[PDB]
Ligand binder design. Structure first.
Ligand SMILES: O=c1[nH]cnc2c(C[N@@H+]3C[C@H](CO)[C@@H](O)C3)c[nH]c12
Ligand SMILES: O=c1[nH]cnc2c(C[N@@H+]3C[C@H](CO)[C@@H](O)C3)c[nH]c12
Ligand SMILES: O=c1[nH]cnc2c(C[N@@H+]3C[C@H](CO)[C@@H](O)C3)c[nH]c12
Lengths: 262, 262, 262
């Protein structure tokens, strides 16, 4: 039962942070690890693994920590690192962090990730707001009778607030694939034909779960590389992390400022 | 064993209805529940849960009953309600009803469903004959060695008979997705590029199983809403059922008239 | 563990063939069974079922044997027949043959298969080099941390060598689907829009596993039929095998000559 698991996790979060309720939750993805400090000074930092239902993150660049940080007038839950479907876990565990955050009081989820850029105007190191997504996993974190509407899944309101922080920000459609292998050039051309501007291996299910649980979502992708075949250069996870690190300053600053505007 | 479980179901059906063999089978989908009255008067009504191999339907608007109704010169098996892949059951259970119907003698399957409309001409409340489908579930109810040809999976002959009943009936390509979450506007634009005119969360596997079993198929979608992003308005299951109810009488009358022409 | 099972299978291969190491591996797919003779005179022939981790092939036209054949200056492992995902096995077993071959020393994998033709200039009986693929199975044979780059997954270098044998060889993008049901005409139109020139039910995962393991790949499809909807004619596995048999002479000769050029 996802509901009870989330409640139990939320209770532990309240007991360890000393805060009965949090207002916003942020998940830092690949390349986003160094952006955690700019969010503010944490009042609590603990291992995600400590929390009920939390499968510890294992991918490089994912700290696997939970931080409670005051940002603006909000108490923010920072999920430094996430698990992915390609790691083999049931989607119940993949979306648990977001559900636990919701049970802890968070009504706004800021989901960040690294992504390959498909639209010609996107450059490596550029943060892109997610306007919508393409779930190409043939799966759903929802089960039986949960008919959730995904119109405005990525709140236009939150994207406008983000632009208030940095009017420069572009938007794009995120394609969520299973992974863990990167795409072939032909698959990238296919994704372009399908309307995708960004490609990654997470987020879509978490967004679906967040909406199903009544929370708004702000998605932010960091273009860590141009999609396969666009340049012809080889992609590697280390390169993804390195690319993300180069924009850590802007990223951390952006998150801190936008969240304060919520 | 699928075949043997289908035979057991067909036998219980014969015993309970007192009819040794049926000629046509109809599966009523979301919103079609109240269309049963217009089909004719049942000689027998029983719970699907009482039939071997039948996983009971659980989605709202799915009665989970089996009726034996005489329509014209045919003895018709009416499967009021169905189970869906999003309910978590293996496909053998999802296509079992159709296989049991075939074992009961049904050589024609009338698969009805609710669907979101993507093509510009479609209106809410409009019945649409399925001309072909797009299986976007990445699954199949068939196993090794079952290399079934899907050309004319939706019998042109039956669509021809349907138009004889209502000359104004339009046709469309149905895209079958996993569900249970509705599609994002971006996914809808993607489906239009893929050639989809209607979008749903059932039917495709049942059609495949029916063809593999040697039965002809007539697919009928009731546009219960325009696809996500077309109107921007929210989608909800209650609304799907409500829309279906507004057209239930017409749908039942249509089915009765078409089937009598078989 | 996949790697351990692979190394173990490789030790058995070495022992039963008396050959401590092989240089090239070739997988013969549907319709390719008779092309084995032209490869050369085998020094050892044994059932795949007798090797660790090898699930026996079951589809008609797949011998299920492993042959050690000297071709040119190379010691070649010939996998006569393969298993498919539609047979229900975990992808670990589907890609095991390739991983075992790599562990046995093979740094080049020649993956052959039967495929439906989508591009208008491709004819039944025509061999087509795979330039790239579209993995439309929503799956991957890899697990967490195995972020493999798939640029040039099908070695341009090996395709060049292939053309030195037959300068008239055409290239095409292969779409890998789950199967086992054949595609609907609407699905074929979709595949064309997605950039597919060939459609099949294997190879993509084996290619991914090969690349992840450090082996180059040469993919060769034999157009055994025009895709569904192109002609309207019925498709069947027997016809696929018959079509393949009609070009077995050309294929066996092609394989023997190309491998000798490696
Ligand atoms: O080109 C790409 N294709 C698919 N995903 C990504 C990502 C995103 N994350 C990064 C990480 C792999 O390096 C995995 O969890 C996917 C960055 N670039 C790409
Ligand atoms: O817009 C749509 N997208 C996907 N499926 C449907 C359906 C069909 N059924 C209806 C039902 C959900 O309300 C589920 O079993 C899917 C109607 N409208 C849509
Ligand atoms: O039209 C086609 N669609 C999908 N696969 C194939 C193939 C390839 N193999 C052949 C075999 C089925 O007959 C199965 O393992 C798929 C040949 N023609 C087609």
């Amino acid at each position: 039962d996802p509901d009870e698991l989330a409640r139990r996790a939320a209770q532990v979060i309240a007991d360890r942070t000393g805060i009965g309720e949090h207002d916003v939750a942020v998940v830092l993805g690949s390349g986003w690890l160094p952006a955690v400090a700019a969010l503010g000074s944490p009042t609590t930092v603990l291992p995600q693994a400590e929390l009920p239902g939390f499968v510890p993150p294992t991918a490089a660049g994912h700290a696997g920590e939970l931080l409670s940080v005051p940002i603006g007038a909000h108490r923010v839950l920072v999920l430094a690192g996430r698990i992915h479907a390609y790691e083999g876990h049931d989607l119940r565990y993949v979306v648990h962090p977001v559900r636990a955050a919701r049970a802890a009081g968070a009504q706004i989820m800021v989901l960040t990730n690294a992504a390959g850029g498909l639209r010609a105007d996107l450059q490596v190191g550029q943060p892109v707001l997610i306007s919508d997504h393409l779930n190409l996993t043939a799966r759903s974190p929802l089960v039986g009778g949960e008919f959730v509407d995904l119109t405005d899944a990525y709140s236009p309101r939150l994207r406008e607030l983000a632009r208030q922080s940095d009017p420069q920000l572009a938007e794009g459609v995120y394609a969520g694939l299973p992974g863990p292998h990167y795409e072939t050039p032909a698959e990238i051309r296919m994704l372009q034909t399908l309307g995708a501007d960004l490609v990654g291996m997470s987020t879509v299910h978490e967004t679906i779960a967040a909406r199903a649980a009544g929370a708004e979502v702000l998605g932010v992708s960091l273009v860590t590389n141009l999609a396969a075949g666009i340049t012809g250069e080889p992609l590697s996870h280390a390169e993804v992390l390195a690319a993300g690190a180069a924009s850590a300053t802007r990223m951390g600053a952006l998150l801190a400022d936008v969240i304060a505007r919520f």
